[PDB]
Amino acid sequence: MNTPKEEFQDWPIVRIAAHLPDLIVYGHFSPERPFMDYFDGVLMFVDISGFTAMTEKFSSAMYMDRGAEQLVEILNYHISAIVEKVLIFGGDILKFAGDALLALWRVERKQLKNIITVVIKCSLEIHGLFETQEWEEGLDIRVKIGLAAGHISMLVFGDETHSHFLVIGQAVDDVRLAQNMAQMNDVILSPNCWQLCDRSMIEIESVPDQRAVKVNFLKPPPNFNFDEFFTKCTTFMHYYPSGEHKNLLRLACTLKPDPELEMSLQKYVMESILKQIDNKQLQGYLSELRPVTIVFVNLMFEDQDKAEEIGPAIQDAYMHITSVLKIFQGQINKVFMFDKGCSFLCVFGFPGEKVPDELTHALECAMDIFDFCSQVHKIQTVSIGVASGIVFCGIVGHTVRHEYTVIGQKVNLAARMMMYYPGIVTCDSVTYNGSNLPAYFFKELPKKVMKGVADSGPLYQYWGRTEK
Ligand SMILES: Nc1ncnc2c1ncn2[C@@H]1O[C@H](COP(=O)(O)CP(=O)(O)OP(=O)(O)O)[C@@H](O)[C@H]1O
Numbered sequence: 001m002n003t004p005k006e007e008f009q010d011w012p013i014v015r016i017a018a019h020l021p022d023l024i025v026y027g028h029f030s031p032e033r034p035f036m037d038y039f040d041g042v043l044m045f046v047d048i049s050g051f052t053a054m055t056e057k058f059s060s061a062m063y064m065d066r067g068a069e070q071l072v073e074i075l076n077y078h079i080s081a082i083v084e085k086v087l088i089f090g091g092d093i094l095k096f097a098g099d100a101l102l103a104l105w106r107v108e109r110k111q112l113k114n115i116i117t118v119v120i121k122c123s124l125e126i127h128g129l130f131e132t133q134e135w136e137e138g139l140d141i142r143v144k145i146g147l148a149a150g151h152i153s154m155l156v157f158g159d160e161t162h163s164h165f166l167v168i169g170q171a172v173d174d175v176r177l178a179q180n181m182a183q184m185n186d187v188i189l190s191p192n193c194w195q196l197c198d199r200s201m202i203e204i205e206s207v208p209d210q211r212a213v214k215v216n217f218l219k220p221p222p223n224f225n226f227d228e229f230f231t232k233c234t235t236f237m238h239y240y241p242s243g244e245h246k247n248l249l250r251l252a253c254t255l256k257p258d259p260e261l262e263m264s265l266q267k268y269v270m271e272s273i274l275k276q277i278d279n280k281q282l283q284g285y286l287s288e289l290r291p292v293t294i295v296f297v298n299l300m301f302e303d304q305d306k307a308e309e310i311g312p313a314i315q316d317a318y319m320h321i322t323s324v325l326k327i328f329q330g331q332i333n334k335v336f337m338f339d340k341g342c343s344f345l346c347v348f349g350f351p352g353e354k355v356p357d358e359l360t361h362a363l364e365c366a367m368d369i370f371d372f373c374s375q376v377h378k379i380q381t382v383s384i385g386v387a388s389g390i391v392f393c394g395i396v397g398h399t400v401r402h403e404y405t406v407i408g409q410k411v412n413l414a415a416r417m418m419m420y421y422p423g424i425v426t427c428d429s430v431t432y433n434g435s436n437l438p439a440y441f442f443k444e445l446p447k448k449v450m451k452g453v454a455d456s457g458p459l460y461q462y463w464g465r466t467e468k
């Protein structure tokens with residue numbers, strides 16, 4: 001009797017699982033919202049620098065009319081290489097934020113020390129991918145890596161059709177601080193990661209005025225075999241592809257149809273992505289250099305580390321945000337904890353979602369979210385950045401692990417606006433001029449120099465309908 005090789009495993013549930021980390025795929029959590037889980041782990045924050053200047057130059061006559069196709073192609077060529085490293089070293093890719101990426105090695109606290117060594121070896125192989133090459137003749141893109149280790153909380157929130165997850169706490173806060181301390185080609189360890197790490201293994205140099213450290217080299221001791229050490233660590237790696245599946249990057253590639261799991265997994269993914277997954281739309285439809293309006297909402301709390309206090313507030317804000325956006329086909333692209341505060345990256349005019357008077361609605365929507373979230377229990381400050389223009393929209397990452405992302409100077413601009421002008425709604429010149437709303441709805445703001453943005457142009461507070 002023949003035993004033919006089981007065919008390519010390409011079910012909708014497998015395609016859905018590409019968009020989600022193992023934290024969610026194999027999560028099986030309560031029905032309730034908010035949901036909170038606590039554990040420990042080791043985080044990697046990989047930032048790519050250069051790619052919004054790339055988005056600008058790919059949004060030029062140069063690339064004829066294939067700017068976004070050429071852009072996602074070269075972006076995914078480098079990002080698939082990093083995703084491969086992280087996966088092969090046992091990491092779970094939690095989230096893509098443009099050309100930036102957060103990874104988790106979730107592990108029992110006694111294994112944190114050993115797992116930090118694994119995550120360092122990984123960090124240095126990632127850097128070593130970008131020691132060689134370059135694009136636009138010479139060099140423009142390298143990576144900065146921040147590492148943290150300790151307590152981690154996960155928050156799951158949403159309603160009957162949508163779900164979003166966040167990771168929270170001091171190791172989350174630390175991994176961001178560690179990353180923006182780094183220069184190109186650096187691996188920065190958070191203080192508690194350096195405190196929990198195997199110091200016989202790792203040569204470091206001190207960071208000026210910062211308690212964090214900078215990794216120089218792995219100097220393993222004489223009886224060290226990394227492959228044997230790695231194998232030892234895999235005992236602690238729940239979902240690490242092994243046995244008949246050692247040839248796979250993700251155990252999630254072996255997921256079988258399960259209606260109840262698929263039902264819960266699809267709530268994390270946009271309906272335009274599911275449409276593609278269902279072969280009801282062309283696979284290239286979703287890669288676009290497209291005019292959009294970014295609404296970046298940031299919520300500050302007295303204590304951004306306590307999921308128990310803040311999770312209800314995030315849930316309540318989500319419930320209001322989701323109903324304000326629905327009206328105008330606005331989307332919550334991502335939610336994430338960003339150097340203080342819970343941030344909602346909201347997008348007006350995604351593919352097939354282009355409402356008329358996008359700018360007036362983006363502004364009215366912002367004020368609405370501003371006023372609601374200001375009266376929610378335990379939200380200290382609400383800040384909203386509004387920016388409009390040509391951004392790259394597309395599926396970013398690896399075949400086995402990818403998400404829909406927005407990339408561009410306008411995304412950086414909205415994000416930086418909500419931080420340099422806290423407690424207000426702000427907008428750029430494109431939104432202000434374009435809305436054509438009367439000039440007294442706006443207040444022109446002082447000029448601030450802002451990180452990761454060259455000329456913002458004139459900026460405005462959206463004051464709203466009344467003088468109040
Ligand atoms: N898709 C996205 N999701 C979440 N945050 C985003 C984002 N795109 C941009 N941002 C935010 O916007 C800011 C971008 O500024 P920086 O981090 O200074 C840019 P960079 O890493 O030097 O280079 P880049 O502009 O080439 O990406 C960050 O604070 C980041 O959180």
Ligand SMILES: [Ca+2]
Binds near residue numbers: 048098099100
């Ligand atoms: Ca980045």
Ligand SMILES: [Cl-]
Binds near residue numbers: 094337
């Ligand atoms: Cl997150």
